Amino acid sequence: EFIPRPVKSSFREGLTVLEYFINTHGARKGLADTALRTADSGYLTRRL
DNA sequence: GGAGAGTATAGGTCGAGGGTGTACCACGTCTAAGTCGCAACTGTTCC
């Protein structure tokens, strides 16, 4: 779910500590999500 | 009969370098190592 407080900083400005922490949630969860996605995709490929 | 629950199944590929032994005694029973003799067996040495 979206956090009601946006990150206003661009990476050119560099992010405050709180903004960086906030961004880590979606970054990491996206990494693990890709990890699972590439697995289930292969399973479906095997069944097909 | 018919519904919940309890049990069964599945869950990416290829690579590189690493990785383990608390605890009864007092004995007889057997074995794990032998040194050691004749046959049995390899070898020369001829005529």
Swiss-Prot record:
Induction: 6-fold repressed by starvation. It comes from the Bacteria. Belongs to the RNA polymerase beta' chain family. DNA-dependent RNA polymerase catalyzes the transcription of DNA into RNA using the four ribonucleoside triphosphates as substrates. The RNAP catalytic core consists of 2 alpha, 1 beta, 1 beta' and 1 omega subunit. When a sigma factor is associated with the core the holoenzyme is formed, which can initiate transcription. This is DNA-directed RNA polymerase subunit beta'.
